[PDB]
RNA sequence: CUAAGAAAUUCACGGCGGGCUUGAUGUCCGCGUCUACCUG
C-alpha cells in the first residue's frame, strides 16, 4: 500500500516498523512485523497490492498517507 | 444597526440533531443566519408582550461534535445517515442525506425595549429563557437538565449600569461564566484588503477565499468560510400570484448564496460586547441580504 | 389544502444514554458509569442463499477456504453490574392542531375549527392514555426489553430544576399490547394531556432500569454507513456512550394505532400517511382503501364528513407526530 | 420547496427562494479536484522537503466532507458527470475545540509538576510556530513584533481556556500525590471550593512566565511586550479569582 | 405458499464474553479475588519454513534468504508462575419463544412457519436440543484450546433467579466425554432447566465456570483478532477474554447427523455444515441434507424430514440469522 | 490420486514454560523456594568506533574527529547479589500427544493417510529413540543458552508434578553428560520412558526444570532480549516478565529439539536444532538443503504419497518436525 | 418566523497454527548558594 522506488525485482515485502541490527554487517536495517505483498514484476513502482489496490493509478496517488518508501533496504527485492 | 441597551444571556444551550450542512460550500458550523431568525423568532413570539425588541446575536460554541464516519479509506469524510420510513408499495425510499451535529451554545442577545422599568430585570429573563426551552433553532431541538448542579440560571446585564469601571467589571463578571467557548464574529473587512493584494492573478473573490485557508504560511488566527446571506437574481414578485409559496403576503425574490469569511475569537481578547450582536442589513433596492456584526473591531 | 401545509413535530424526545449498575442499588443511578462501545472482530463463513449456477460441490469449499473477517462493534455491561439504565428526557410542546405551513388562511381557520370541535367535546385523554403506556412498558427500551428478569421505569415531572411528581411503574406486569386502566396512569395521562392542550411545554424525565444478566450484551442503534477492512456495524456514541437515536424512540412512543382494517388482534403499529410498517413490509390503510390519513383530512374539513372517532384519533395522532404534504 | 423570509429594516418580510447553484459549485469542484492530485500535485509534491520545483505550492486541504446524491440513481438531477455520483466536496467552517479532550488533569510531571507545560497540540502547535517570528526582526518590526506579540497574546489568551476547561471537570483537585506541582499555582489553573484558604495565588503564572514565555519561546518585543501581554494576563487572572 | 423476501431470527443461547483469571487448585467456594491473567508483548524471531515454490530451490539463494531475519512481536497470555489453575467465568443467557421470526414479508408464510414449529415442539419437546446443549457446558468444549493436556477440568454452574443462585452444579469436564451423549442424574437437571428455558416458560440465565489445571507458568489462549504488532489478543479491561461467538460456536456442537459418516463426532450447527478448521462443508447442496432445502421442503410443500433432522432444522433456527434471498 | 495438502499445519508439542532466574548461594540448594528474583536494572556505557571502515572513507583527520564523540548508549544488564553465586533457572514442560493429527487439512484422504503412515511409525517402534534424545537435552542442561560456558558445576533437577506433589524426583549433573554424545544412563531412561508414554499418549506428563549454574559472586547472568522499535536512546533490552529476567519460552524448547544428528556432511559438528529446511542461523548457511532429496517436505511427499519409507533415521526425523509444529501448506 | 417543517438501518458469525534477536563498549573534569524575620 505504498508508491516505492524504481526496483522491479519481485514480489516485495514491506513493514513501516525498523529495528537496526548490527551484527552481520553486509544487511542494514532488518525489519519488524513484516507483511507480505505482490506486484508479481509490475512496470512501474506504485504497484504494491496487498488486497485491494491494484489498478487505479489516480487513487494510489491519492493514497499517499503511507507512501514513496525508499525501498534501499535488506535486499534489492525487500522493501521499506 | 443601532446600539444595544441589555445585554440579555442565554446560559447554557444544549441542542440535539441540529443542522451542519447549511450551504452548498460548508459543513461546519451551522449559519448564523439561524442564529439571526431565531430571536426574531423569539421576539415574535414573547418580545410583543413583555414590550421589548431584540436584533443582534453572539454565539459562544461551548462544544460541537459532528456525526462523520471514514470507511477506512480517505481523511475526508461520509456522513450520518437517517431509516426512512416505506413508501405505498412498502419497498424503498429514494433517500437524500443530510448532515448532523450536536452543538451546544449559548447565546447573548441584545435588547432595545422600554420594559425593563415595569418588569424586573430578573423575571424578563426568567420568562424568556423559559420560552426558548420550547423551540427550535437550527433545525434541532433544545434539550431540558439533568439532576446535577444547576448553571441553568441564566443572568442580565445592562451596559447602562454604572460607570466605565463598573462596565468593564460586570463585563468579566459575565465573561467568567462564558469562558470555555469560542465566540464567532464576522470577517468582512481583510477579504477587501486581500483582494487588491491578490488582483495580479485573478480577481474572482471564490479562488480569494479559497487559498486563505487552503515552508508553510501563515495563517493569523482561525480563518473560516461562511454563509453571509443571499445576492438575489429574480426580480419582486407579488404576493398573490406565486403559486407554492409559504404564505400569500409576501413578495418573492429568488437567491443564491454569498460566501464571506469570519473569525473565531476567544471571548477575551475582544474590545467589549457589543461588537458581536448579529445584525442583519437588507438593502432592498435591487440588492441583497446581508447578516454581519458592525463594529467588528 | 392549497400548496403546502406542514406540522411541526410535538412529543418530542431525545437521546437515551446509557450505564450499568447493580440491582437494589438502582437509586443511586447518578454516578453510574457509561457503556462504552468496544470493538472485536469476526470471522465469518458463508450463510446465503446461492444460485442455481452456484451451489457445485467444488465451488463452495473453495469459499470456506477464504471465509469473510469483519470487525464489529459491541458493548457490554462490565462483567459485575447485571442492570442497565437508559436515560431520555422527553419534552411535549401543546398547541396540536396548528401547523406552520399555509398560504391558505380560509383552510387554516376551519381546520383550527375541526379542531377546536375535536379538543372541546373530548380531550387528549385517549391518546395520552396510550402515550402514557408506551412509557409505562418500555417500547423505547427496544430489543433490551426482552427477557429481562424485571424492567422497571421511573419518571420525573420537572418544570423548573425541582423534581413536581415522580412515578414508579413495573413493565411486566403491564402489558406489551393492551390498554387497561391505572390509578396513576389515568393521571399521567391527565398531565401530558394538559401539557398537549395549552400552551407551554410540559417536561419529562425518564429512565429505566432493566435486569439483564452480568456482562451481557445490549444493544444501542446502529449507524449506516472497498471489500478490505470492512468494519460493518458500527453503534452510535455521544458523549462516549452507546445511545438511542431519537427517531428509534419516536417509533416506540407512537405505537398506538389499533383500528386497522387488516388485523386488530396482532397489536399497535406506529402511526403514518400510508401507515406502513418497515419490518411487515406492507402498507396498511392504503390509498386505495378510504381510511387513509390524507384522505381522511379532506372529508373531514374540506367536504365535512365527520368519520368515526378512531379514525379521528388517527388523524389528529398523525397531526401530532408532524409532517408535510403538499 | 424550501423557502425562508427575512425581516426588513422597520417592515414586514420578504421571502427568499433559495436555489441550488451548479455553475459556481464546479468551479470550486475543478479548483479544489487538481490541487489533491493533478500537476500541482503530483508534480513539486515535495516541494517544501527536498528543493522539488520552485515556483509551486503545497495546497494543503484539511477536513474535506462530502455528499452523496442517492447513489445508483443518477438520471433525476440534471448536469451529469459519470465520476459524480454525489461527489461535490464540502469545505470545512468549524467552530475550534471540536474534540474536547481536556478532561483529566492529572498528577503528572508537564502539565503537573509545571504550570507552563501546555501538553496540548494547539498549543505546540502555536509554541512550534514562533520560530518564524522569533528571528532577528529588525527590519520587520510589525512582522517580528507584531505578528509574534499576537501570537504571544494567542498563546497567552488559549491558557485560559487550558485552565478553566477543566474548571467543572471535577468537584476539586483535593489533595493527591503529583499535583503539588500543580499545588504551587493550585488557584488559578487548578479547583474551586483570604489569601490561602479564602482566596487564589494571583502569582504562580507570574513563575509560570518564566518557564513557558521565556523558557520555551532583537530584544525589546522578547521582554517588553510579552511583559506587558504578561502583566495583562495576570490582571484578568487577579480580576475573577476575588 | 412462497418462500419471504426478508426473514430474520434473532439468536436465543446468548453468552457473554468469558473472562480469565488464574489461580491455585484446592481452592474451592474462595475463587471470587482471583487476579485477571493478562496480556503482554515479546519479541520472537524464527527463520524461514514455509513451502517453496520450485523457484527457489537452489542453494544459491536458500542462504540468501536465511540471513534475512523475520523479527515479529506477538503477544501471549501465561498464568502467574505460582498458579496453577485457569477459571474462565461467562453468563449465559437462555431466552426462548423459539419459532416466532423478528421479521417477515408474507403473514401466510408467517403463521405457516409459526404452525410448524408448534406442531413440532408440542410433539416432541425441546428436550434432545437441552440434553445435547447441556453437554456443550458439561465437559466444557468452550475451553477451545485451553481443555487439552489438563490435569481435571471441572465447571460449576449456578443458576441465578435473583442476584442470588437458585441451583448449583459440580461437574467434572473430562468423566464426561467429547464423544458420547450419556444421560447422567444431574445433567437431566440441566436439561429440562434449559428445556423450561427455551419453551419460553420462564427465563433462565447461567453463571457457568470452568477450572483447567494446566500448569504453573505455562500458556493459556485467548481469542485473537486482526491485523489493522503481528497477533493481537482480545483484552476486555485488560483482561484476557475469549470471544462471545467463539464461546458461541463451542455451544452449539451438537451436529451429529451428518450425510457423510457418524464416526467423526458432531461439529457446530451451520446451514452447510461448515467446519473450517477441516476446510470441507458436510451437508452439501448437491446433497438434500442441508438446511435451506430442509426449510422450503418442510413448510411449503409440507413434506416432514426424519424425526433426527427436525431437531437439526430447529437447532439452525436457535442459531439465528438471515434467510430467503 | 492423493494429491499434497493446500493448507496443513500442526498444533506443537512439548511445550515449555516461560524461564525464570533468581540467584543464591550453591549450600543452600535444596531449600531454594524463596531465593529472590534477578532482577533488571539499567546502567550507561561508552562505546566507540569498532566497524570496518570502507575504503574510501579511511582519511587520518576524520577517525580521530569521528571518535572524539561516542556513542553513549543506555544498556540494560542483569547481574547476580553480590553475596550470591549461583543461578537458579525454573521452568516448567507438559507433554501434550498425539503427535500425528493435525489442525487444518484439506483433503481428508490425505489427512487419513497421514494418521495411518503415523500409526504405522508409532506401531512398529515406539518414540523411545525420540525419547531418549528429549531427555538428553533435559539433562545436560542446553536451556542454559549463554549462562552454561564456563560454568562450575551445573546440577539440574527435574520432577514429576503429577498431582500438586511430586511424583518422582530426578538430579543430574549437565557436565558428566557431554553435549554431544548421547549416552545411555539408568536414569536417562526412566525419564526416556515418561517422555515416550507422555507423547504417545498414555497419560499426562508435566515437568518441573530447575537448573542451577555456578557462575560466581556478583557475575553476569545472560537473559533474552526484545525489541526496541522506535533523542532518549537505549539498546538492549532485557526481557523481564514481572520484573525477573527471563528466557523466552522459545529459546528455551529451542534446546529441547536440538536432536538432529542425521543429515549430510556431518563432520561430528554435534546435533542442529530439527526445522524444515534444517538450518542454523549461527552456522549462517542451511543444511538439508532441497537439491539434495534429505529435505522435510520432500520426506513427506515421498512417505504419505508415493510411500517410499525412508530410512528410520530419517523417520526419527519427520516425526520430530512433526512434532515441533508449524505450517506446512502452500501459503 | 431559523436551506424551519419529516423520518426505526436491522438480523448471524471459530482468526489460527509456528518461531534463537544475537556480539562488544571508559562518561569525563571544574564549582561559595548567601542576607534577614515575634507563629497568641
Redesign the interface.
Known amino acids: 500500500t505504498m508508491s516505492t522506488a524504481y526496483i522491479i525485482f519481485n514480489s516485495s515485502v514491506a513493514a513501516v516498523?525498523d529495528?537496526e541490527?548490527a551484527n552481520?554487517?553486509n544487511?542494514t536495517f532488518?525489519?519488524?512485523?513484516?507483511k507480505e505483498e505482490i506486484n508479481a514484476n509490475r512496470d512501474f513502482n506504485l504497484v504494491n497490492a496487498q488486497?485491494?489496490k491494484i489498478s487505479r493509478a489516480?487513487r494510489w496517488?491519492?493514497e499517499?498517507?503511507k507512501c514513496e518508501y525508499f525501498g534501499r533496504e535488506?535486499?534489492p527485492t525487500?522493501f521499506f | 444597526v443601532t446600539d444595544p441597551e441589555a445585554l440579555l444571556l442565554l446560559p447554557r444551550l444544549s441542542i440535539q440533531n441540529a443542522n451542519a450542512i447549511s450551504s452548498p460550500l460548508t459543513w461546519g458550523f451551522p449559519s448564523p443566519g439561524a442564529f439571526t431568525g431565531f430571536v426574531h423568532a423569539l421576539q415574535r413570539r414573547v418580545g410583543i408582550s413583555l414590550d421589548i425588541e431584540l436584533d443582534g446575536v453572539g454565539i459562544v460554541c461551548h462544544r460541537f461534535e459532528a456525526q462523520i464516519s471514514q470507511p477506512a479509506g480517505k481523511r475526508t469524510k461520509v456522513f450520518n445517515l437517517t431509516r426512512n420510513p416505506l413508501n405505498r408499495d412498502g419497498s424503498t425510499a429514494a433517500i437524500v442525506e443530510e448532515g448532523r451535529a450536536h452543538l451546544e451554545v449559548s447565546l447573548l442577545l441584545g435588547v432595545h425595549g422600554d420594559g425593563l422599568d415595569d418588569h424586573p430585570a430578573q423575571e424578563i429573563a426568567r420568562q424568556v429563557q423559559e420560552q426558548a426551552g420550547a423551540m427550535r433553532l437550527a433545525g434541532g431541538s433544545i434539550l431540558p437538565w439533568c439532576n446535577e448542579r444547576f448553571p441553568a440560571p441564566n443572568a442580565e446585564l445592562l451596559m447602562l449600569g454604572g460607570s466605565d469601571e463598573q462596565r468593564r467589571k460586570n463585563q468579566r463578571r459575565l465573561t467568567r461564566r462564558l469562558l470555555p467557548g469560542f465566540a464567532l464574529v464576522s470577517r468582512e473587512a481583510l477579504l477587501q484588503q486581500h483582494l487588491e493584494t491578490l488582483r495580479t492573478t485573478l480577481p474572482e473573490a471564490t479562488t480569494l477565499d479559497a487559498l486563505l485557508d487552503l515552508q508553510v504560511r501563515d495563517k493569523p488566527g482561525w480563518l473560516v468560510p461562511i454563509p453571509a446571506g443571499y445576492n438575489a437574481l429574480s426580480p419582486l414578485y407579488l404576493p398573490g400570484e406565486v403559486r407554492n409559496a409559504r404564505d400569500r403576503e409576501t413578495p418573492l425574490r429568488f437567491v443564491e448564496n454569498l460566501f464571506g469569511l469570519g473569525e473565531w475569537l476567544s471571548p477575551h481578547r475582544v474590545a467589549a460586547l457589543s461588537d458581536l450582536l448579529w445584525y442583519h442589513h437588507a438593502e432592498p433596492d435591487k440588492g441583497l441580504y446581508r447578516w454581519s456584526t458592525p463594529r467588528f473591531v | 389544502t392549497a400548496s403546502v401545509l406542514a406540522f411541526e413535530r410535538k412529543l418530542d424526545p431525545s437521546d437515551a444514554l446509557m450505564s450499568a449498575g447493580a440491582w437494589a442499588q438502582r437509586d443511586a443511578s447518578q454516578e453510574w458509569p457509561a457503556v462504552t462501545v468496544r470493538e472485536k472482530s469476526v470471522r465469518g463463513t458463508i450463510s446465503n442463499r446461492l444460485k442455481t449456477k452456484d451451489r457445485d460441490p467444488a465451488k463452495l469449499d473453495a469459499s470456506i477456504q477464504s471465509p469473510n473477517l469483519q470487525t464489529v462493534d459491541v458493548a457490554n455491561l462490565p462483567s459485575d453490574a447485571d442492570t442497565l439504565k437508559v436515560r431520555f428526557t422527553l419534552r411535549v410542546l401543546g398547541g396540536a392542531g396548528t401547523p406552520s405551513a399555509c398560504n391558505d388562511a380560509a383552510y387554516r381557520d376551519k381546520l383550527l375549527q375541526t379542531v377546536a370541535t375535536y379538543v372541546n367535546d373530548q380531550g387528549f385523554a385517549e391518546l395520552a392514555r396510550r402515550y402514557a403506556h408506551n412509557l409505562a412498558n418500555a417500547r423505547f427500551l427496544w430489543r433490551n426489553r426482552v427477557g429481562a428478569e424485571a424492567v422497571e421505569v421511573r419518571i420525573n415531572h420537572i418544570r423548573q430544576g425541582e423534581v413536581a411528581r415522580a412515578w414508579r411503574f413495573d413493565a411486566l406486569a403491564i402489558g406489551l399490547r393492551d390498554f387497561k386502566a391505572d390509578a396513576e396512569l389515568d393521571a399521567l395521562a391527565e398531565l401530558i394531556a394538559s401539557g398537549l392542550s395549552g400552551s407551554g411545554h410540559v417536561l419529562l424525565e425518564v429512565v429505566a432500569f432493566a435486569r439483564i444478566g452480568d456482562g451481557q450484551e445490549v444493544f444501542p442503534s446502529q449507524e449506516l454507513i472497498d471489500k478490505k477492512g470492512q468494519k460493518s456495524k458500527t453503534l452510535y456514541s455521544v458523549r462516549d456512550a452507546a445511545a438511542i437515536h431519537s427517531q428509534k424512540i419516536g417509533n416506540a412512543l407512537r405505537t398506538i394505532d389499533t383500528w386497522y382494517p387488516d388485523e386488530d388482534g396482532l397489536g399497535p403499529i406506529a402511526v403514518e400517511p400510508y401507515g406502513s410498517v418497515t419490518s411487515q413490509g406492507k402498507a396498511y390503510r392504503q390509498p386505495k382503501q378510504k381510511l387513509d390519513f390524507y384522505t381522511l383530512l379532506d372529508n373531514w374539513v374540506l367536504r365535512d364528513e365527520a368519520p368515526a372517532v378512531e379514525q379521528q384519533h388517527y388523524v389528529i395522532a398523525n397531526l401530532i407526530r408532524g409532517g408535510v404534504f403538499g | 420547496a424550501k423557502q425562508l423570509y427575512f425581516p426588513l429594516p422597520g417592515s414586514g418580510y420578504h421571502l427568499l427562494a433559495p436555489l441550488f447553484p451548479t455553475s459556481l459549485v464546479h468551479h470550486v469542484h475543478a479548483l479544489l479536484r487538481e490541487a489533491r492530485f493533478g500537476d500541482a500535485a503530483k508534480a513539486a509534491r515535495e516541494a517544501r522537503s527536498r528543493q522539488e520545483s520552485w515556483p509551486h505550492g503545497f495546497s494543503e486541504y484539511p477536513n474535506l466532507a462530502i455528499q452523496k446524491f442517492g447513489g445508483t440513481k443518477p438520471q433525476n438531477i440534471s448536469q451529469l458527470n459519470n465520476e459524480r455520483r454525489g461527489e461535490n466536496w464540502l469545505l470545512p467552517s468549524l467552530p475550534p475545540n471540536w474534540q474536547r479532550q481536556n478532561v483529566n488533569a492529572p498528577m503528572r510531571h508537564s502539565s503537573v509538576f509545571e504550570h507552563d507545560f501546555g501538553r496540548t497540540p494547539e498549543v505546540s502547535r502555536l509554541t512550534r510556530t514562533l520560530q518564524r517570528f522569533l528571528a532577528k526582526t529588525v527590519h520587520n518590526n510589525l512582522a517580528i513584533r507584531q505578528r509574534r506579540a499576537q501570537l504571544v497574546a494567542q498563546i497567552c489568551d488559549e491558557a485560559l481556556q487550558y485552565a478553566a476547561r477543566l474548571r467543572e471537570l471535577e468537584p476539586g483537585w483535593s489533595a493527591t500525590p503529583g499535583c503539588q506541582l500543580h499545588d504551587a499555582e493550585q488557584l488559578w489553573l487548578d479547583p474551586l471550593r483570604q489569601r490561602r484558604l479564602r482566596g487564589d495565588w494571583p502569582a504562580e503564572v507570574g513563575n509560570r512566565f518564566a518557564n513557558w514565555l521565556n523558557r520555551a519561546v532583537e530584544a525589546a518585543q522578547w521582554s517588553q511586550e510579552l511583559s506587558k501581554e504578561l502583566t495583562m494576563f495576570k490582571e484578568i487572572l487577579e480580576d475573577e479569582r476575588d
Not at chain 1, 532488518?30 to 513484516?34: A, F, P
Open positions: 516498523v529495528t541490527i552481520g554487517a544487511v532488518s525489519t519488524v512485523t513484516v488486497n485491494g489516480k496517488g491519492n499517499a498517507s535488506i535486499n525487500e
